[PDB]
Write a protein that binds this ligand. Structure first.
Ligand SMILES: Nc1ncnc2c1ncn2[C@@H]1O[C@H](COP(=O)(O)OP(=O)(O)OP(=O)(O)O)[C@@H](O)[C@H]1O
Ligand SMILES: Nc1ncnc2c1ncn2[C@@H]1O[C@H](COP(=O)(O)OP(=O)(O)OP(=O)(O)O)[C@@H](O)[C@H]1O
Ligand SMILES: Nc1ncnc2c1ncn2[C@@H]1O[C@H](COP(=O)(O)OP(=O)(O)OP(=O)(O)O)[C@@H](O)[C@H]1O
Ligand SMILES: Nc1ncnc2c1ncn2[C@@H]1O[C@H](COP(=O)(O)OP(=O)(O)OP(=O)(O)O)[C@@H](O)[C@H]1O
Ligand SMILES: Nc1ncnc2c1ncn2[C@@H]1O[C@H](COP(=O)(O)OP(=O)(O)OP(=O)(O)O)[C@@H](O)[C@H]1O
Ligand SMILES: Nc1ncnc2c1ncn2[C@@H]1O[C@H](COP(=O)(O)OP(=O)(O)OP(=O)(O)O)[C@@H](O)[C@H]1O
Ligand SMILES: [Mg+2]
Ligand SMILES: [Mg+2]
Ligand SMILES: [Mg+2]
Ligand SMILES: [Mg+2]
Ligand SMILES: [Mg+2]
Ligand SMILES: [Mg+2]
Lengths: 470, 463, 467
């Protein structure tokens, strides 16, 4: 026309959706972060993807690492650079020391037009000036300007010392570059959280703020929070809960494309509903994943066997997959990526998390919510009926279903609670709510035996039941 | 002191007329705050409104770059630059002081302009040395009689205003653009620190960068009548005594699964049939689940949308900041012109934000549906079912005109619901807790809860 | 303390009370500020007030701003420096670059040339932006000492980078001078609160801490929220509330010199009690102001009529004035300013605020209390019956009267509450107390209709769910 900026798709999982296309063409993009944020990896993926996807020859300019180390390091992510160097599709410009700007611009311009390279990656300019906050501005501006005329899209790596200090080392590089990306490795308590951020994109629009990401065997995996987004398919289909009495209490089964949440005090029978729930899928030749977060695979099996359920059988048949882990063993972003990886490989019909309350421990209520949105959102988009557990910190203290306030993110709510009746400790199941279906509104009493849960009749001749002592 | 209007949506209000004429205005901020976009909107608007010539001095960027990025919003920087209306004086050093001021005055005259935009004065000095040099620039510029905009750069978001700590004391007018990190979410605000010799609005104001450039949001002149509209529930209309006032803010509150998302359905529909337009801003449920559920209750949102008498939005509250959300609801109410508006829910947009930020949001939204005579039903889920003592956890009860209380009542091992009209500003309403049930048709309010005491607690004791 | 130091009257609203007389005579005063805090506007209002109210000739020394702009700016408030200069009463001794002993010589020349008593320099910093801590200290000393010898009460302006960092830009000026004032512009979560403080007055006493102030069309307006009075002036004169049945429970209406507070949950009748309180004023031929922060003039008059009250007419008689505002527009300091200014241009018999709770939203508990003591102490100091409203965050089980703890600053409390009676939400009014009068120590029923309140017969109704 023109009426915008043409972008260059990076092919990095999530980055194209945040930048709304990729990296502005011909312009230089600054990618600064602390040590081990994924700067070197970002610039490599930028080139590797450009060649493997579009045959856009790339140039990589290293200052510390050796060309042989750049290739051996890239080996972990399972991509062969030595094969691309030989094909004349990738060239590693070794501008490193050994046991001024003019000389470099030359070599970079020599290798660009030699390989018809459309993509370039410098890592990391900073190490070069290692002077004066003014000198770095001029020397940097010179490089950025000289690279602009060539019409080559560059990715400049910059080092940092603080997670929230100045954007770049000298507090100047940010204004020189047209596009700025910040890679963070923030420390919560003792867990590291990876966040990528597009600060500015001179010309075009983008998504603002930090976005969680992970470094896996596939490289950088970003997760656009609300991209995009609240547009998952919803069917009026029904699925069994594993309990006939609960099937009826919910208007004849659960609901394919729904999030179920069983809440209650400790030992109310949450892991039972989960056991019967996962076993039902396997009694229909359907796959199911049970994400255990508070019981060993050995205990779940022995407890399920006392309820008349053979988890080992469903496992030998490859219908049931148990994934146990410590919530504190990793970050909430890692758990999400782990879960998403499991659903893609195993491709199950039902999912269960025992429990959500355990993942919400020693974490911000905001970080936990963004997690529940990711798990529930991903499950709804794939029409994977998910059942989430939640333990009440309080026993016989009503108020709110959850202390995390995830009631509005759930579609169905099964409320389990203790009830002191005649110096005994009875239990009461209840379908608090069910979106898109009629549901039983009775506070039914249920028992637990070797034959699972026997849902009996409600307490008609009782007031103040919800109090836990009527 | 006379001020020339900028036409930057909201800035003229905060500045009370615009920018002090014949005086330099400093605009400092961090990277990607809008310092450069601010200066371009200054010359552009000043022209495409008043044909007032304008000059632009660059130090890092290239004229080709300015014109290139100048598009994005669809600004003919090409024609204007060539039409003789605008001129871009380069000044960047070759890749491989007094002359500047001389090249500038010659430019101001050679084009006959009263709007200049320097950017950036920091790129240069690369602060006792910057104090004098910056003094001379701003000084000689006051004589030329030009209203300047000098862009500066900052490192910290709440630290110094400029780089060296003088730029502010040299300039007469200071504006601060910010990009504060609101826990993973970015909130850009504009504040006028000082306007020598004139009054302005103190403090920071939230703004957003969009296709129409910048849209700053400043902040009780409304207007109401006695005209009443339906709620979709014939009875609920009887409990309110004719229904809801055309120009009013309604609030349905209760625990989860009480029937607030239902009422929102009937409310949006009472407009669909009446041949009126209704917008639904959903933040909890997906379009698909709503429609499916919308149908499981009778109403057919699929058809109501085809007749162009309804607009379902759908968005994550965590997708953007409160400011961004407000700008959507707004830019969405002006490109549809609806009679009433529904929000499901307020508790959703309150999540992961400060009570202060949320309140500033609920006011701005409400402060709109009013200055536009639009019916506004807002939903709110109480994170306390049974034994709750408050209409809202965010305390927004004294910002709404009507309130619908939905609560759970345990009547002998039975989870029963109870609707009520807690209040109704400037009307009679039924002041009794009515038991209601939900079917495949919608709500059905029955007799009250007589023969029971302490219904409020949620576990009453029959008399 | 036998003989105290003679102080120069500033005539800057509130400053003379904080300083205990004004600026010590013969000594220079440092006014450190953070850019746009009001360092210049203070140095001008200092000379101006001297020239206009004491014939005290003034000399304003500029180091950056042109004498033109200095004057051009003053017109903003309605001052005419151009005139006061043509008379040789004031002199803008320009010193803006295109030393040391030069400026001093020029100074003493003007002081004696104009017999000037007040001097103001703005600023002794941009003069150094063209040094080292060791230099400025001795440089700043040479200036002060010389002025102390001339015997001219000076006001030297200084710049600050941080709001709570060093006093001056070098950490020296704070000690060279005898008197130090700190003008702050602190960011209180998006809203700006400017406060004045006297860090030290060598040889005399003063009020310590920060004092909130505003910059308006009448210059700097400080509020010494601390010591003033509490001498007051009260009477046994009664005032009707416009309900009749309430005036009875109050022992014959409210006291003319008293603070009335109407507390209750939302939709209780706090706004209705204000209407009835206002109509009574327009009937007794008395001017009344209404500060509505929740509803707009439109919604008020419309809601007022529904209660059989012509708010539209009451104003058509220049007897009622509705001041609709937003608590989120400005800060408390800015509200207290608009409220006072409003009372001084109308001089009403009674004012009603709807509501205190709306103004206590997003502000600290101490900043609010300060504001309440402000409007309360002011409404009382002018013998004006003030009625304040306060919404309760919770209903049925309210532990206390107010969540902000404002009850002990009120004299009369009108407690409103919801009462559940057999699946029916009923209302109950009560006079919780009355400073120096008998009141109906009983919670009575209460209904609202086309008219207004109708206090029915009396009746644990406190829990909101009686038995
Ligand atoms: N196969 C892999 N699986 C998971 N993580 C990996 C894998 N390979 C590398 N990593 C992680 O990626 C990081 C390497 O990122 P990269 O070298 O790009 O960081 P950087 O920001 O450039 O660091 P520096 O500035 O110190 O050079 C390591 O910290 C390592 O934990
Ligand atoms: N074979 C059995 N016979 C009878 N009751 C049993 C049997 N097995 C388990 N239970 C009961 O079930 C309870 C445990 O059920 P479950 O593990 O589902 O509880 P939960 O809600 O998941 O608790 P937690 O959150 O502590 O893990 C025990 O407290 C016990 O009362
Ligand atoms: N068409 C568009 N729609 C929405 N947002 C846009 C559009 N074009 C640009 N933007 C955003 O507006 C911002 C304006 O950047 P601007 O050049 O004003 O920053 P700056 O403060 O000058 O930065 P620096 O200090 O580094 O020069 C960009 O960062 C970009 O994110
Ligand atoms: N007529 C007016 N009415 C209301 N407010 C005004 C008026 N004129 C100026 N102001 C306000 O008062 C301020 C004036 O303060 P002043 O110019 O004294 O700042 P300062 O502390 O001297 O700043 P600097 O250190 O940069 O010189 C302006 O920022 C403006 O907000
Ligand atoms: N077809 C139906 N028949 C009977 N009951 C139904 C039917 N559809 C829905 N319901 C009931 O009505 C409720 C609908 O909840 P709704 O979404 O209206 O309320 P909400 O408080 O807004 O919910 P949430 O907190 O999830 O946003 C469910 O709890 C369910 O029990
Ligand atoms: N014309 C009328 N006829 C009967 N009852 C009415 C009428 N107008 C209002 N009401 C009742 O009185 C209430 C109005 O009282 P008022 O406006 O003083 O409440 P409030 O305590 O100020 O509440 P808020 O602080 O939420 O505005 C309404 O909620 C309604 O119940
Ligand atoms: Mg690296
Ligand atoms: Mg368990
Ligand atoms: Mg710029
Ligand atoms: Mg809902
Ligand atoms: Mg000044
Ligand atoms: Mg009211």
């Amino acid at each position: 026309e023109h009426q915008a900026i043409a972008k260059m798709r990076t092919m990095i999982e999530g980055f194209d959706d945040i930048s709304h296309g990729g990296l502005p063409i011909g312009r230089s993009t600054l990618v600064s972060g602390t040590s081990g944020t994924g700067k070197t990896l970002f610039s490599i993926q930028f080139l590797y993807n450009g060649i493997i996807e579009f045959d856009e020859p790339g140039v990589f300019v290293t200052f510390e690492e050796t060309p042989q180390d750049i290739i051996k390091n890239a080996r972990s992510f399972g991509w062969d650079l030595a094969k691309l160097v030989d094909e004349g599709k990738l060239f590693i410009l070794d501008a490193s020391p050994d046991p001024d700007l003019s000389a470099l611009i030359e070599r970079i311009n020599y290798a660009i037009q030699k390989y018809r390279a459309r993509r370039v990656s410098i890592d990391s300019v900073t190490s070069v000036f290692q002077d004066a906050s003014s000198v770095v501005r001029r020397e940097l501006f010179r490089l950025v300007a000289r690279l602009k005329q060539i019409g080559a899209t560059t990715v400049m790596t910059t080092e940092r010392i603080e997670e929230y200090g100045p954007i770049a080392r000298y507090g100047v590089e940010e204004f020189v570059s047209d596009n700025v990306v910040i890679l963070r490795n923030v420390l919560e308590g003792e867990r590291r959280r990876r966040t990528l951020e597009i600060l500015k994109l001179r010309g075009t629009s983008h998504m603002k703020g930090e976005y969680p990401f992970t470094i896996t065997d596939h490289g950088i995996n970003i997760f656009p929070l609300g991209a995009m987004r609240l547009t998952q398919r919803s069917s009026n289909v029904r699925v069994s809960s594993g309990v006939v009495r609960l099937d009826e209490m919910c208007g004849g089964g659960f609901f394919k494309d729904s999030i179920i949440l069983a809440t209650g005090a400790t030992g109310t029978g949450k892991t039972l509903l989960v056991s019967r729930f996962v076993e039902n899928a396997c009694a229909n030749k359907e796959r199911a994943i049970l994400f255990a977060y508070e019981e060993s695979r050995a205990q779940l099996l022995r407890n399920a066997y006392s309820w008349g359920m053979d988890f080992e059988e469903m496992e030998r048949q490859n219908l049931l997959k148990i994934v146990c882990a410590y919530p504190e063993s990793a970050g909430l972003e890692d758990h999400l990526q782990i879960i998403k990886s499991e659903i893609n490989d195993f491709k199950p019909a039902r999912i269960a998390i025992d429990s959500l309350s355990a993942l919400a421990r020693g974490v911000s209520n905001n970080a936990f919510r963004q997690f529940v949105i990711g798990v529930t959102g991903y499950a709804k988009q794939e029409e994977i009926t998910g059942l989430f557990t939640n333990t009440s910190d309080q026993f016989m203290g009503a108020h709110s279903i959850t202390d995390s306030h995830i009631s509005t993110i759930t579609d169905t709510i099964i409320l389990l609670q203790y009830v002191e009746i005649r110096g005994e400790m009875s239990r009461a199941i209840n379908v608090f709510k069910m979106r898109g279906s009629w549901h039983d509104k009775a506070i039914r009493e249920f028992m637990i035996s070797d034959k699972g849960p026997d849902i009996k009749d409600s307490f008609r001749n009782f007031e103040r039941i919800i109090s836990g002592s009527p």
